[PDB]
Design an enzyme around this catalytic site. Sequence first.
Site, PDB file in Angstrom:
ATOM      1  N   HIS A 130       0.775  -1.233   0.000  1.00  0.00           N
ATOM      2  CA  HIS A 130       0.000   0.000   0.000  1.00  0.00           C
ATOM      3  C   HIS A 130       0.821   1.308   0.000  1.00  0.00           C
ATOM      4  CE1 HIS A 130      -3.756   2.282   1.257  1.00  0.00           C
ATOM      5  NE2 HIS A 130      -4.169   1.508   0.266  1.00  0.00           N
ATOM      6  N   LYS A 136       2.905   4.502  -0.806  1.00  0.00           N
ATOM      7  CA  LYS A 136       2.850   5.400  -1.942  1.00  0.00           C
ATOM      8  C   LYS A 136       3.990   6.413  -1.841  1.00  0.00           C
ATOM      9  CE  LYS A 136      -1.885   4.195  -2.423  1.00  0.00           C
ATOM     10  NZ  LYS A 136      -2.056   3.513  -1.119  1.00  0.00           N
ATOM     11  N   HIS A 172      -9.005  10.192   0.702  1.00  0.00           N
ATOM     12  CA  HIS A 172      -8.276   8.978   0.426  1.00  0.00           C
ATOM     13  C   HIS A 172      -6.963   9.147   1.188  1.00  0.00           C
ATOM     14  CE1 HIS A 172      -5.562   6.171  -1.733  1.00  0.00           C
ATOM     15  NE2 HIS A 172      -6.635   5.403  -1.637  1.00  0.00           N
ATOM     16  N   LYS A 228      -4.873   9.579   4.657  1.00  0.00           N
ATOM     17  CA  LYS A 228      -5.066   8.996   5.970  1.00  0.00           C
ATOM     18  C   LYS A 228      -4.199   9.839   6.903  1.00  0.00           C
ATOM     19  CE  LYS A 228      -5.494   5.389   2.965  1.00  0.00           C
ATOM     20  NZ  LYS A 228      -5.694   5.643   1.512  1.00  0.00           N
TER      21      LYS A 228
END
EC number: 3.1.4.-
Lengths: 437, 439
Positions: free
Chosen positions: B103, B105, B333, B335
């Site tokens: 996950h 990025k 989107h 967090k």
Amino acid sequence: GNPFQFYLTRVSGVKPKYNSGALHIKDILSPLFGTLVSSAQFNYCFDVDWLVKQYPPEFRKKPILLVHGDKREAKAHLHAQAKPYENISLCQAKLDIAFGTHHTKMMLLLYEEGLRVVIHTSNLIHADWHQKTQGIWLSPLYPRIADGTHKSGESPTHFKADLISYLMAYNAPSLKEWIDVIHKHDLSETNVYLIGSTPGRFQGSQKDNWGHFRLKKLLKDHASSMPNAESWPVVGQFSSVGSLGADESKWLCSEFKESMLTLGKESSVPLYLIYPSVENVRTSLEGYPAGGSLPYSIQTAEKQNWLHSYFHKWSAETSGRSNAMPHIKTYMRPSPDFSKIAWFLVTSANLSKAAWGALEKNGTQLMIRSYELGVLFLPSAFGLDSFKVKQKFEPMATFPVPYDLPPELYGSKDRPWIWNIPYVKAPDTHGNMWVPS
Amino acid sequence: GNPFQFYLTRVSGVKPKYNSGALHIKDILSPLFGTLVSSAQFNYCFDVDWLVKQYPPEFRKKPILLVHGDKREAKAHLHAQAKPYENISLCQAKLDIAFGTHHTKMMLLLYEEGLRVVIHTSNLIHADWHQKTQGIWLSPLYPRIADGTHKSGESPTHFKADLISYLMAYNAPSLKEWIDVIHKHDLSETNVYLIGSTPGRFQGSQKDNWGHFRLKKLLKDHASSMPNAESWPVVGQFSSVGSLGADESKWLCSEFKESMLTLGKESKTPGKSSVPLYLIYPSVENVRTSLEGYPAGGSLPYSIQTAEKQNWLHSYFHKWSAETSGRSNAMPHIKTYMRPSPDFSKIAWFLVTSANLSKAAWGALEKNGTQLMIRSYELGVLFLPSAFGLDSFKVKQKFTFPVPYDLPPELYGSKDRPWIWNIPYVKAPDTHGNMWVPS
């Protein structure tokens, strides 16, 4: 139903009394209307999966011809939706003129017992038959001409020849087949005039075949000028607007209005234009999303604010559709007090030169960019002097005008609906705002 | 005037003043930030044709490494997407623990003038940069260390060593080259701490290397506890929820909260701290009225299966509100996790990361509390006042740290419900006139 055979599409969300007399595409395709053998669907936008589900389960395997005008990727996407259904054939109407579209909405229905023709204003997607005001004209069931028997199956309005000629302009293999089907049927019972638009640059006699010139020819030869005709206003109601020019004199109050006010063969008229206001859309049944179907862009609008002085609100308490935004396009000639009309036209043609045509080469040529189709109701075709308005949408004499008369002028704070700018100060009927792109 | 270098991505549709100061991926890859030589794109989801077009024309043939975690068919699809581009290589991050995902990025950008590191929250697909609230951390331009020179190039936050350890956990050839590129650069200006999650089972020394224990460790060593600390809440905003257990004591208010409320090397609990925990997650109504409408729910993957087993969790949910950044309608989107004061006028720290509210991302204690198990790869950066010479951060509001959403958070209404992606919503239409009818 009625002698005019003019109906509105069913609307979800209004009282049932407002849908008794209304038609849904499933009612049109019903077996009660005949034993379907083949059919053709002319339209702008399609949702094949949806469309197939509108046909009765038994007729779902019969051949279907989709006549559209999509190019490139759009065309491929369409073939893709069709791929699954093998009984479906497509026909891409040529648009050899810049910025033209195939806007014509019609259904050709071949039955064992005969033929039916349907001319309407709905795209073949669920949303155009859900909560919008749409128009429909149902031809009667035309019987097949006794095979081996000679007879023109023509009507006083020349419908048969005019439809064949319209289909002829496409110059397509698959339509030539439908032309032959029509030739074999008796359409003499038809009492409306066909008004079509095809792409092209027409000179000479051909100038009278299509667009606003075609409208003019018919009002000249089949309507009669009454006394004080000058005070009989002209009404135009549409769902989209094109660039009409720097001022009214460039096209609107010039060649367009000229055709619209023609009556009889002999010889300052008020022009009312009905187009949904932002408020009309904001509080509609669908809310702002209804505006997705009223494509008036800011780029076009800002160049012609002179036009908006002619705009009137959409109001249809007569048919209980004041909240069902219009996708129907209509044009008519009411009397000074609006209790009657000299003629009524339901069509797919909006207020643009592309749909109605514009004169070129020093008024010698009429240039038309796309396909449009509609039917004209003339009192003489019904053996009447005029039509009495049915102010609640004497049967064989009162025409069902779907909206209210007279039209109410836009208030000073009102503004025309422009689909490509945001509306964020006031939420719509569903608590949402409109933010394009 | 942003020593934090924290940005939100541009949102199509908001007033221009809410994008002045926001970044689009094209802005991040533009010649203005440096003359690209090569880059690494760490992500979860990729649309290669779209991505290649985001680079400037003159930089589209420079080498690009896509670091992903796809397996089998998904992996083949990705290889097919990149096949047309000769300059693109792929690195499949190993995911040896079941149900894990890559996950993280991040973008590693090597220029002629130096090196830049970008840790953010967006997938490399058009929709993630169109109308969503996403977060970005921009590293400074790190200069090359003089070959003849011998310097560590380390920062007080140990970001260089920490980023290298993170990459090392991949045990990949292609990432070893990037590790060497990082070795040659001076990252001493970095003022944020790196918080990563890496698949594995950690005990002993490694125990504090990742997940919520990594955060706990940093908070213990570089943050100071204050009087009335028990009244400073904890905030967590995410876009997805995992299975947290039958009740709040299973993991959430047990080990997770314990890590998040850590402050200082001291320890005081005896009849004192019962810190409030605010969780921010979009309600069905937040989504219905969003710029995207129900389709935004496609990126908030909370399944009914998971949800029905932990309805206790929803009593903690608060709505998405972001008037302060003009993004109440741009679904989150991004967090984030933070520790505001009782009146929300300040925060003790702020974290932006790829990590959602799940054991998979933060880790779950196993083996009688001696081992931390993590299933996925995650990455974020922590902002601590001490690293900026401050004692606390002032919140930059709507009416100083730029918190992207409004404080205090607003609790779900009695008729509000958490967005659950796989059940239909047909009572009211969205901003595009549509309904939601799943699977």
